[PDB]
Amino acid sequence: RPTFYRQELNKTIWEVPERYQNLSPVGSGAYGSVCAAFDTKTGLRVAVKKLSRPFQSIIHAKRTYRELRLLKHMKHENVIGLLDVFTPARSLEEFNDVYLVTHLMGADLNNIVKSQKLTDDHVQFLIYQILRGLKYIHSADIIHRDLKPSNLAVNEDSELKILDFGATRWYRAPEIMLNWMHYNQTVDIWSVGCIMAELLTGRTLFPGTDHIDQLKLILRLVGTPGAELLKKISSESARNYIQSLTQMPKMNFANVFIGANPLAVDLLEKMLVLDSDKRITAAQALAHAYFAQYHDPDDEPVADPYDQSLESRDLLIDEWKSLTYDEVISFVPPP
């Protein structure tokens, strides 16, 4: 067992191994809080997440277990991975707090586009990495669901990792916003399209003021649902309502992307398709000519399959807690 020390951070006492130094809050929410830190044992800048009352409720306990399991599973250059997980507890009976440690990287994509747009060459490298990470995540039968610039961590050399800390709706696929009976991994490709567009233009693609505005903006770029897609919407009244959200024909798509690489625009047109069944997949996108400088079919690895049964489980807090404890004590750090 490492030696721990205690300090007050974000209104609670954080108790962490002495290797972790210079803890500085960077974000907080209902589910927990995150500090930037320096890991003196590895010389790495790290993020340390303390879960907020991880076993207070069934939902908190389930989310705690899910996050630990997922992070333990992810072993890919472009996906955030677990560097460490710890608890100050010495037994299950005293187990009450969980801390997760990941690479910090140093910045996110929420920053770089404020003053000016990125070069096409830069966008190639950034989106290539997002898609490479996403191919991996999707291959594990995991849907991200909240891809956005603040969930994309980048270092000074623009090496990128996808994370989920756990403006808000600007990158969301329309079907998530419209409570589709089911949706699938194609929602993340929509998000990549929105992100890529923004890097190229320096501006948010669909900056909706609210839910309906968001949908109207989307419909104005990509067009009202066509005949094939309309068949996939059950409600007559819903289809009638849709037909009111547009008053003019759709625009020339390319007008948003003046002077852009034609291959970039072609890829964007293939990502930003209203009908999710028709969107390009991560694997297909990696093979698109836009990424010729980076694509290597032998260096775009896939994930071991993931036991996702626990996402639909209805369990007692103490079961989620015991399952989580097992995962904490069995953790082995990466080489």
Report the catalytic residues.
164
Pull the structure tokens for residue 129. Answer: 């990495």
Q: Per the annotation, does 226 bind a ligand?
A: no
The reply, when asked if residue 28 is annotated as ligand binding, is yes
Q: Which of residues 116-175 bind ligand Z83 (CB under 6 A)?
A: 137, 142, 144, 162-166
For residue 90, give every residue at least 6 positions away whose Cβ sits within 8 Å of its Cβ, in sequence order, or none. Answer: 1
Binding mask 162-181 for ligand BOG (x = CB under 6 A): ------------xx--xxxx
195 binds ligand Z83 (CB under 6 A): no
- Closer by beta carbon to ligand BOG, 41 or else 220: 220
Q: Which of 35, 37, 51, 74 binds ligand Z83 (CB under 6 A)?
A: 74
Collapse the DSSP code of 89 into the 3-class scheme (helix H, G, I; strand E, B; otherwise coil) and give the result: coil
The maximal CA–CA distance of the chain, rounded, in angstroms, is 66
| 228-267 binders of ligand BOG (CB under 6 A) | 229, 232-234, 238, 241-242, 245
- Report strand pairing: 44-51 vs 84-86: unpaired
Return the one option of ligand BOG, ligand Z83, none that residue 47 interacts with (CB less than 5 to 8 A, by type): ligand Z83
Residues 275-294 that bind ligand BOG (CB under 6 A): 275-277
**How wide is the angle at C-alpha 139 spanned by C-alphas 73 and 120, nearest 5°?**
105
Burial code of 32-71, b = ≥16 C-beta within 10 A, e = fewer?
bbbbbbbbeeeeeebbbbbbbebbeeeebbbbbbbbbbbb
27 labelled ligand-binding:
yes
Sign of CA dihedral 270, 272, 273, 277: positive
Binding residues, by number, are: 26-34, 49
Residues forming contacts to ligand Z83 in the complex (CB under 6 A) are 34, 47, 49, 63, 66-67, 70-71, 74, 79-80, 100, 102, 137, 142, 144, 162-166
